[PDB]
Design a binder for these strands. Structure first.
Lengths: 55, 55
DNA sequence: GAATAA
DNA sequence: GAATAA
């Protein structure tokens, strides 16, 4: 007979404890920025022109 | 098959019968003492003075 | 608070 | 949607 004593012991079933490559981490990129919009200038991006948000 | 007859017999589980160092004995130190308090003297601890209990 | 906590 | 899907 194959028998033995132990604690937190069990007949051995399938164990592969590596995930099958499924895991998800979640960060939020957080980029608060104080900015200025200057239309008072003649230079490049400072003009009467609409300033763009390139989402 | 592994089997045998016996009395007060069991499949063998974990047995270490030494305690993990936890045991408590309790005595009371008992020290009744008849004593005298003498303030009638001039010598050392015999005076008008309060005699002390140094618990 | 089988490994001794009266 | 024992092999990680918060």
């Amino acid at each position: 007979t194959k028998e033995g004593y132990g604690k937190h012991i069990t007949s051995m079933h399938v164990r592969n404890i590596f995930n099958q490559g499924n895991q998800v981490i979640r960060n939020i990129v957080k980029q608060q920025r104080y900015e200025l919009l200057d239309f008072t200038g003649t230079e490049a991006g400072t003009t009467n022109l609409p300033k763009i948000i390139p989402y």
